[PDB]
Amino acid sequence: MRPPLIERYRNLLPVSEKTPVISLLEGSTPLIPLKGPEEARKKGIRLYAKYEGLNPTGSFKDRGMTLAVSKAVEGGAQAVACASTGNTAASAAAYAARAGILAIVVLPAGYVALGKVAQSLVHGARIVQVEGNFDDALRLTQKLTEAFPVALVNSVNPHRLEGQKTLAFEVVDELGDAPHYHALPVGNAGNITAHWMGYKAYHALGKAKRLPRMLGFQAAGAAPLVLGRPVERPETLATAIRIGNPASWQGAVRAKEESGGVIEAVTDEEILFAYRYLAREEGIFCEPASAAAMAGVFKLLREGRLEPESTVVLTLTGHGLKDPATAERVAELPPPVPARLEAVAAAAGL
Amino acid sequence: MRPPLIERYRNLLPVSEKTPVISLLEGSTPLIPLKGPEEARKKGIRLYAKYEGLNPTGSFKDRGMTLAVSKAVEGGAQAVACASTGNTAASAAAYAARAGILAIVVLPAGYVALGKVAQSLVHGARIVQVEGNFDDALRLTQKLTEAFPVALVNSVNPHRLEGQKTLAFEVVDELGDAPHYHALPVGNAGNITAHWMGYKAYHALGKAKRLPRMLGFQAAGAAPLVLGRPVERPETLATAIRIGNPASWQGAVRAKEESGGVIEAVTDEEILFAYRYLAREEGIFCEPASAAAMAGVFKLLREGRLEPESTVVLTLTGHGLKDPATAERVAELPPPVPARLEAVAAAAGL
Ligand SMILES: *Cc1c(COP(=O)(O)O)cnc(C)c1O
Numbered sequence: 001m002r003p004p005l006i007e008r009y010r011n012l013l014p015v016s017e018k019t020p021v022i023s024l025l026e027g028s029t030p031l032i033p034l035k036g037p038e039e040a041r042k043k044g045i046r047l048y049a050k051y052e053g054l055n056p057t058g059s060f061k062d063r064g065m066t067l068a069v070s071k072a073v074e075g076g077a078q079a080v081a082c083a084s085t086g087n088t089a090a091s092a093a094a095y096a097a098r099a100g101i102l103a104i105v106v107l108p109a110g111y112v113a114l115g116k117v118a119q120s121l122v123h124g125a126r127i128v129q130v131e132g133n134f135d136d137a138l139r140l141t142q143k144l145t146e147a148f149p150v151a152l153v154n155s156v157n158p159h160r161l162e163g164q165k166t167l168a169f170e171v172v173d174e175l176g177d178a179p180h181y182h183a184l185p186v187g188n189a190g191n192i193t194a195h196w197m198g199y200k201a202y203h204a205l206g207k208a209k210r211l212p213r214m215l216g217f218q219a220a221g222a223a224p225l226v227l228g229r230p231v232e233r234p235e236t237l238a239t240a241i242r243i244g245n246p247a248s249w250q251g252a253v254r255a256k257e258e259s260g261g262v263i264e265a266v267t268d269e270e271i272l273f274a275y276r277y278l279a280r281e282e283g284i285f286c287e288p289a290s291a292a293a294m295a296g297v298f299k300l301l302r303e304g305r306l307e308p309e310s311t312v313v314l315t316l317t318g319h320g321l322k323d324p325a326t327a328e329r330v331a332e333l334p335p336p337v338p339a340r341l342e343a344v345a346a347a348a349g350l
Numbered sequence: 351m352r353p354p355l356i357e358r359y360r361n362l363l364p365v366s367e368k369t370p371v372i373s374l375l376e377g378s379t380p381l382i383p384l385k386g387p388e389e390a391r392k393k394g395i396r397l398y399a400k401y402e403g404l405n406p407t408g409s410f411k412d413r414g415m416t417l418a419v420s421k422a423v424e425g426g427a428q429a430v431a432c433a434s435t436g437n438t439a440a441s442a443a444a445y446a447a448r449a450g451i452l453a454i455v456v457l458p459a460g461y462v463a464l465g466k467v468a469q470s471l472v473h474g475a476r477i478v479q480v481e482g483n484f485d486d487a488l489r490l491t492q493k494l495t496e497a498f499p500v501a502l503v504n505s506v507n508p509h510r511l512e513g514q515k516t517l518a519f520e521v522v523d524e525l526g527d528a529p530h531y532h533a534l535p536v537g538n539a540g541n542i543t544a545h546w547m548g549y550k551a552y553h554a555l556g557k558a559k560r561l562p563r564m565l566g567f568q569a570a571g572a573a574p575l576v577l578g579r580p581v582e583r584p585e586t587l588a589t590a591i592r593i594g595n596p597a598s599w600q601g602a603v604r605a606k607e608e609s610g611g612v613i614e615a616v617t618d619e620e621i622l623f624a625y626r627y628l629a630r631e632e633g634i635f636c637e638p639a640s641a642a643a644m645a646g647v648f649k650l651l652r653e654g655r656l657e658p659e660s661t662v663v664l665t666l667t668g669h670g671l672k673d674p675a676t677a678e679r680v681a682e683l684p685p686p687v688p689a690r691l692e693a694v695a696a697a698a699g700l
């Protein structure tokens with residue numbers, strides 16, 4: 001039923017019989033067809049949500065991690081390393097535990113909320129805090145990949161991009177062709193770069209007639225790609241895309257230019273609106289960063305920038321359960337009422 | 351495109367052409383073959399984990415809710431209601447949202463933490479806390495469904511049980527035959543009941559060669575089915591199975607006797623151990639209650655009560671992201687080290 005990602009696309013991936021398949025049955029996620037919004041429905045525009053939140057660790061990063069770790073193990077690596085918290089750390093820790101190797105996470109001795117590393121820790125991640133800054137931490141991470149058999153699994157790891165482009169493969173397999181547009185969040189730009197690589201690869205194989213316009217969106221307070229310059233003070237509630245200087249900058253610009261798409265911004269308020277829309281009207285619960293993709297579609301529709309009768313696919317990068325802080329900001333218990341049927345039906349709106 | 355759960359097994363479910371399919375592409379969850387544990391390899395036993403945590407809302411509840419809501423709407427219902435929290439409320443809210451109807455959750459004021467219903471609220475759940483106790487909320491919840499166009503989607507909703515039968519169908523479709531043993535958590539016992547009914551249903555069709563032995567497990571502090579009598583004040587860190595009087599008592603007992611299986615208890619300590627094992631060894635992150643199933647396998651293994659060379663399927667009911675409280679609880683961050691390559695490599699264990 002649910003096969004290993006690398007197995008499903010073995011012929012299209014940099015693997016061989018010598019590649020130890022370290023999988024958690026990631027990928028092959030649901031492509032939920034959305035009912036609306038009505039602004040899209042009235043123009044005959046159909047939306048589909050690639051629910052990447054339904055991956056083993058909760059984010060699409062499992063796609064690149066499964067391959068990155070598999071190749072790392074093939075290369076004889078005793079452990080994978082990254083200089084980040086959140087999903088990347090959680091995914092790396094999970095696959096390292098599956099592979100039976102160590103997962104190293106180097107971070108500055110500063111303040112770190114256990115929420116950002118709790119998941120990676122339960123998996124057995126080796127978190128090391130150093131008396132330095134983000135620069136020193138990422139520096140020590142590299143040197144650790146030069147003096148010891150450690151594989152750096154950060155955003156620039158080629159294998160991560162190779163594995164993440166499979167999402168595009170799955171979309172085409174389901175729809176029968178590439179969509180007209182494809183919206184997704186943009187943090188370090190590795191995912192958008194991979195997406196484009198995927199669609200171009202499927203077109204070169206003859207499995208896709210068209211190439212979609214990549215619609216990447218960033219949070220207003222953290223849109224270095226929109227401003228065309230690094231943002232030394234990234235600000236946004238969408239933690240996953242709180243990036244001031246994307247590692248895959250060049251890749252993002254290329255995908256934007258070649259696909260004839262755009263990389264624009266949406267405010268946190270817009271992100272929160274899309275966040276609620278997906279949950280309350282589509283039944284889809286994703287984290288804010290992911291909602292940004294839907295916020296992007298709302299923006300273009302509002303501007304009438306999406307051709308009618310077109311198909312729009314959105315990559316909801318992470319599951320809502322990933323960020324309880326935002327859920328609690330939106331959630332609220334109503335004032336209690338008397339234990340009477342009349343009062344209940346009233347407060348219920350019946 | 352991919353056919354929804356209730357359509358995949360339409361011939362085995364009480365649905366028809368007039369049944370409005372309210373789906374979020376739930377089901378078809380991964381069946382991850384576990385590496386161990388060692389105690390299992392020792393006897394040549396094979397364990398497979400049915401990752402129900404990868405369902406739309408994060409729990410297997412979606413299997414029953416997709417059918418419950420679909421039927422409710424077919425019946426003309428304008429909303430569904432329950433007196434639950436956690437996973438049931440979140441699931442009911444998600445599908446209600448998908449269906450475009452209301453999801454009412456009646457709770458006793460002051461008894462429920464915001465976190466326990468945050469997910470449902472994000473989906474637009476209409477929470478109504480009454481000035482009384484669970485008995486009052488439970489009482490007027492059914493009264494609400496009697497006086498108004500609201501379908502009751504509580505534990506005993508026959509459709510929720512029928513929909514949960516599909517999990518067994520999927521296990522057989524992939525393995526080719528039913529496993530020798532099938533362990534899972536036991537709260538209201540509606541799931542273990544559904545599992546059994548699903549297995550003997552596929553067996554009556556010829557799709558399943560044999561019938562598995564249902565191995566149900568409860569937390570020691572909340573094991574009414576193990577003690578053979580209700581538990582006034584059930585207690586355990588596994589909130590999902592913290593039930594003192596299972597609504598499906600009878601169904602669970604029958605499934606136990608008919609399958610020649612068991613319904614035993616495991617301590618919270620044992621649950622946490624399995625919890626850590628799955629994540630630290632298999633790379634699978636599930637919530638405490640789900641880990642109870644694995645803790646049970648460990649138990650029967652120590653007691654040498656599992657036939658060697660046998661296949662064991664574990665239903666991991668919910669995803670670990672469902673309980674950030676526990677994950678951060680067992681979490682631990684070691685003291686910082688100097689920003690020297692020799693310091694990091696050492697702390698990491700290189
Ligand atoms: C990593 C991540 C992103 C950002 O993707 P980039 O490839 O870094 O652009 C967005 N959302 C979630 C949930 C993520 O885990």
Ligand SMILES: *Cc1c(COP(=O)(O)O)cnc(C)c1O
Nearest residue numbers: 437537538539540541590667668
């Ligand atoms: C609902 C639930 C259970 C209990 O299942 P029952 O059918 O009540 O026995 C166990 N674990 C999780 C994660 C659940 O959501």
